[PDB]
Amino acid sequence: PDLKNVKSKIGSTENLKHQPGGGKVQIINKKLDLSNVQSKCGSKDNIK
Amino acid sequence: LNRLISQIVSSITASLRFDGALNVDLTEFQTNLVPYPRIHFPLATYAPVISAEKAYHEQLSVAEITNACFEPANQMVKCDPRHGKYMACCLLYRGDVVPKDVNAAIATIKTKR
């Protein structure tokens, strides 16, 4: 006898393209703007 | 041979003829025993598999009976399963069996990797 060609069915041989692929993460951080800010009591200029 | 075969199928259908702590349906089998659809045929075991003379000289715990299930001589298919690699083992209990020692015992088998 002869079998010519035969192969397995179905598993890890059909998976070899798809890893799958991974990704990327990031924070999750900010600031605030302070540029407007002055004190809200204010007598010391009255020295004038 | 037909009476020991019976005790195996009885034990596989115990979970659907009476109540229990963890209750495995006959549809559940495929999802844990079949990793690919044609790699579908698991070998059988059951235990204890002793006569009345012997019962009174051995410890008969969930630990002891679960550990004996793995012994290559006492498999219901005549092959040394050491020749190969286990893929999934489905273990199915009956009687005075507390789940904690099922968890211990099956953990010990794996711990003998």
Swiss-Prot record, chain A:
Crosslink (Glycyl lysine isopeptide (Lys-Gly) (interchain with G-Cter in ubiquitin)) position: 4, 9, 17, 31, 48
Modified residues (N6-acetyllysine): 9, 31, 40, 48
Residues listed as glycosylation sites in the UniProt record: 9, 30-31
Localization annotation: Cytoplasm, Cytosol; Cell membrane; Cytoplasm, Cytoskeleton; Cell projection, Axon
Marked site positions, Not glycated: 4, 7, 17, 24, 40, 44, 48
Effect of residue 7 to T: In PIDB; reduces the ability to promote microtubule assembly by 70%
Highest taxon above the source species: Eukaryota
Organism: Homo sapiens
Disease field: In Alzheimer disease, the neuronal cytoskeleton in the brain is progressively disrupted and replaced by tangles of paired helical filaments (PHF) and straight filaments, mainly composed of hyperphosphorylated forms of TAU (PHF-TAU or AD P-TAU). O-GlcNAcylation is greatly reduced in Alzheimer disease brain cerebral cortex leading to an increase in TAU/MAPT phosphorylations.
Residues where Phosphoserine is found: 12, 35, 43
Post-translational modification: Phosphorylation at serine and threonine residues in S-P or T-P motifs by proline-directed protein kinases (PDPK1, CDK1, CDK5, GSK3, MAPK) (only 2-3 sites per protein in interphase, seven-fold increase in mitosis, and in the form associated with paired helical filaments (PHF-tau)), and at serine residues in K-X-G-S motifs by MAP/microtubule affinity-regulating kinase (MARK1, MARK2, MARK3 or MARK4), causing detachment from microtubules, and their disassembly. Phosphorylation decreases with age.
Record PTM N6-methyllysine, positions in chain: 9
Domain notes per entry: The tau/MAP repeat binds to tubulin. Type I isoforms contain 3 repeats while type II isoforms contain 4 repeats.
Name of the protein in its database record: Microtubule-associated protein tau
Protein function: Promotes microtubule assembly and stability, and might be involved in the establishment and maintenance of neuronal polarity. The C-terminus binds axonal microtubules while the N-terminus binds neural plasma membrane components, suggesting that tau functions as a linker protein between both. Axonal polarity is predetermined by TAU/MAPT localization (in the neuronal cell) in the domain of the cell body defined by the centrosome. The short isoforms allow plasticity of the cytoskeleton whereas the longer isoforms may preferentially play a role in its stabilization.
Modified residues annotated as Deamidated asparagine in this record: 29
Assembly information from the UniProt record: Interacts with MARK1, MARK2, MARK3 and MARK4. Interacts with PSMC2 through SQSTM1. Interacts with SQSTM1 when polyubiquitinated. Interacts with FKBP4. Binds to CSNK1D. Interacts with SGK1. Interacts with PIN1. Interacts with LRRK2. Interacts with LRP1, leading to endocytosis; this interaction is reduced in the presence of LRPAP1/RAP.
Tissue expression as described in the entry: Expressed in neurons. Isoform PNS-tau is expressed in the peripheral nervous system while the others are expressed in the central nervous system.
Tau/MAP repeats: 1-24, 25-48
From Swiss-Prot, chain B:
GO cellular component: cytoplasm; microtubule; microtubule cytoskeleton
Residues with PTM Phosphoserine: 6
Domain of life: Eukaryota
Chain coiled-coil ranges: none
Gene Ontology molecular-function annotations: GTP binding; GTPase activity; metal ion binding; structural constituent of cytoskeleton
Keyword Metal-binding annotated: yes
Subunit text: Heterodimer of alpha- and beta-tubulin. A typical microtubule is a hollow water-filled tube with an outer diameter of 25 nm and an inner diameter of 15 nM. Alpha-beta heterodimers associate head-to-tail to form protofilaments running lengthwise along the microtubule wall with the beta-tubulin subunit facing the microtubule plus end conferring a structural polarity. Microtubules usually have 13 protofilaments but different protofilament numbers can be found in some organisms and specialized cells.
Protein name per the record: Tubulin alpha-1B chain
Organism the protein comes from: Sus scrofa (Pig)
Gene: TUBA1B
Residues of the full protein shown: 227 to 339 of 451
